[PDB]
């Protein structure tokens, strides 16, 4: 199976698999059952921002999800990615709906990763920023129901002609270039990701969430990973 590390913005409480009884953010290490969560006061129809950071000094994955003029939700988990992920990975956003649904619109996405060698103390770096998404955006690998074009946005899951989000949808966007996320010969390794998102549910019954994830390079949507599986995991283990 794929190897997945993710920060989930989980809008739908799946209590039978360990979600708390509220929308939450979580750190997922190789399981949809988050190693750490924090309550998140999701605001239907409002643009939010998620920021994810990790560095190899502290080896601590943290995320903050906020809306303008509201208290943020923050979650952090100590994890040595050297021991979890392969050296080379792809990074992406994923989202899903199930019986219930929501738009999973990404308005912008930025990422920076840096690796400083122990041998030379010089740094390799990758940065991309998308503040608009184009039709046929060739530096993104779109998977499942993900599309770009409309409003200059990235719609991770399916939205109908009238703007209604559809259920049982899953889709992901991965940056095209593999990222050298860790290396033993590195003094400091670090990455940050930021994306802005618009989650909208008419019936005020949102599901299932958005995730930033890091994966093996050839990662694909696990078959059937709609709903609570967030397009990330083949099961709920």
């Amino acid at each position: 199976a794929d190897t997945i590390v993710a920060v989930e913005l989980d809008t739908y409480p799946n209590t039978d698999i360990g979600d708390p009884s509220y929308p939450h953010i979580g750190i997922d290490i190789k399981s949809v059952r988050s190693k750490k969560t924090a309550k998140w006061n999701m605001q239907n129809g409002k643009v939010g921002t998620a920021h994810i950071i990790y560095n190899s000094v502290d080896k601590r994955l943290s995320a903050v999800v906020s809306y303008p003029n509201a208290d943020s939700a923050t979650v952090s988990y100590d994890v040595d990615l050297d021991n979890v992920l392969p050296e080379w990975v792809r990074v992406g956003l994923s989202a899903s709906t199930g019986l219930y649904k929501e738009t999973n619109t990404i308005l912008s996405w930025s990422f920076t990763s840096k690796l400083k060698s122990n041998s030379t103390h010089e740094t390799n770096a990758l940065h991309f920023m998308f503040n608009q998404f184009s039709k046929d955006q060739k530096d993104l690998i779109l998977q499942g129901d993900a599309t770009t074009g409309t409003d200059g946005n990235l719609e991770l899951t399916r939205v109908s002609s009238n703007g209604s989000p559809q259920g049982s949808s899953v889709g992901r966007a991965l940056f095209y270039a593999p990222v050298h996320i860790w290396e033993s010969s590195a003094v400091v390794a670090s990455f940050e990701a930021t994306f802005t998102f618009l989650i909208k549910s008419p019936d005020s019954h949102p599901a299932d969430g958005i995730a930033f994830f890091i994966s093996n390079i050839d990662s694909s949507i696990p078959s059937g990973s709609t709903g609570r599986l967030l397009g990330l995991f083949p099961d709920a283990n």
């Binding site: 739908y12 799946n14 019986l99 219930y100 019936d203 019954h205």
Partner: peptide, 4 residues
């Protein structure tokens, strides 16, 4: 069926 959490909403339900």
């Amino acid at each position: 069926g959490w909403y339900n």
